Design a protein around this motif. Structure first.
Motif, PDB file in Angstrom:
ATOM      1  N   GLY A 253       0.801  -1.204   0.000  1.00 30.27           N
ATOM      2  CA  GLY A 253       0.000   0.000   0.000  1.00 30.27           C
ATOM      3  C   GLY A 253       0.840   1.261   0.000  1.00 30.27           C
ATOM      4  O   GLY A 253       2.027   1.264   0.326  1.00 30.27           O
ATOM      5  N   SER A 254       0.194   2.360  -0.382  1.00 30.95           N
ATOM      6  CA  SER A 254       0.829   3.668  -0.446  1.00 30.95           C
ATOM      7  C   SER A 254       0.232   4.653   0.548  1.00 30.95           C
ATOM      8  O   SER A 254       0.646   5.817   0.579  1.00 30.95           O
ATOM      9  CB  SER A 254       0.726   4.233  -1.865  1.00 30.95           C
ATOM     10  N   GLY A 255      -0.730   4.219   1.356  1.00 30.62           N
ATOM     11  CA  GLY A 255      -1.410   5.112   2.268  1.00 30.62           C
ATOM     12  C   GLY A 255      -2.497   5.949   1.640  1.00 30.62           C
ATOM     13  O   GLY A 255      -3.094   6.781   2.331  1.00 30.62           O
ATOM     14  N   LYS A 256      -2.752   5.714   0.348  1.00 28.25           N
ATOM     15  CA  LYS A 256      -3.769   6.513  -0.382  1.00 28.25           C
ATOM     16  C   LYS A 256      -4.855   5.595  -0.959  1.00 28.25           C
ATOM     17  O   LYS A 256      -4.506   4.659  -1.710  1.00 28.25           O
ATOM     18  CB  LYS A 256      -3.120   7.344  -1.494  1.00 28.25           C
ATOM     19  N   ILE A 257      -6.118   5.849  -0.609  1.00 28.55           N
ATOM     20  CA  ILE A 257      -7.245   5.088  -1.126  1.00 28.55           C
ATOM     21  C   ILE A 257      -8.131   6.035  -1.921  1.00 28.55           C
ATOM     22  O   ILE A 257      -8.300   7.202  -1.550  1.00 28.55           O
ATOM     23  CB  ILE A 257      -8.041   4.388   0.000  1.00 28.55           C
ATOM     24  N   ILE A 258      -8.666   5.542  -3.035  1.00 28.20           N
ATOM     25  CA  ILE A 258      -9.594   6.307  -3.853  1.00 28.20           C
ATOM     26  C   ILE A 258     -10.918   5.560  -3.903  1.00 28.20           C
ATOM     27  O   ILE A 258     -11.008   4.380  -3.561  1.00 28.20           O
ATOM     28  CB  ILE A 258      -9.059   6.564  -5.279  1.00 28.20           C
ATOM     29  N   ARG A 259     -11.957   6.271  -4.314  1.00 23.92           N
ATOM     30  CA  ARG A 259     -13.292   5.705  -4.410  1.00 23.92           C
ATOM     31  C   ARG A 259     -13.761   5.736  -5.859  1.00 23.92           C
ATOM     32  O   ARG A 259     -13.136   6.352  -6.726  1.00 23.92           O
ATOM     33  CB  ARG A 259     -14.258   6.458  -3.489  1.00 23.92           C
ATOM     34  N   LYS A 260     -14.880   5.053  -6.112  1.00 22.04           N
ATOM     35  CA  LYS A 260     -15.390   4.931  -7.473  1.00 22.04           C
ATOM     36  C   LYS A 260     -15.687   6.285  -8.102  1.00 22.04           C
ATOM     37  O   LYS A 260     -15.710   6.393  -9.333  1.00 22.04           O
ATOM     38  CB  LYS A 260     -16.649   4.064  -7.480  1.00 22.04           C
TER      39      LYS A 260
END
Length: 53
Positions: free
Chosen positions: A17-24
């Motif tokens: 992981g990179s610590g960054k999550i995105i959503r649809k």
RNA sequence: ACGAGAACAUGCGCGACAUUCCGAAGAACGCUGAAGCG
């Protein structure tokens, strides 16, 4: 000191992981094509501003 | 109406010359972006 070359053979998918999550909302999901277009937010926002969308 | 009367302890002279506050020294040691799964 001895040296070696580590060969990691991926038998199961690996996600560092990179610590960054995105959503649809943030990215594109063509279900029929079954492809996810990762996009960057600033370019999309400026494109919509230019197009008035 | 004094062992007294005058009579500058004074004149020329730089606290000055030579000097690196340097010498040696890893901001690095350990540290899985991961756990549960609702």
């Amino acid at each position: 000191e001895k040296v070696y070359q580590v060969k990691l053979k991926v038998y199961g998918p690996v996600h560092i992981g990179s610590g960054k999550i995105i959503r649809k909302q943030e990215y594109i999901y063509d279900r029929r094509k079954s492809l996810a277009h990762i996009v960057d937010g600033p370019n999309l926002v400026k494109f919509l501003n230019k197009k008035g969308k």
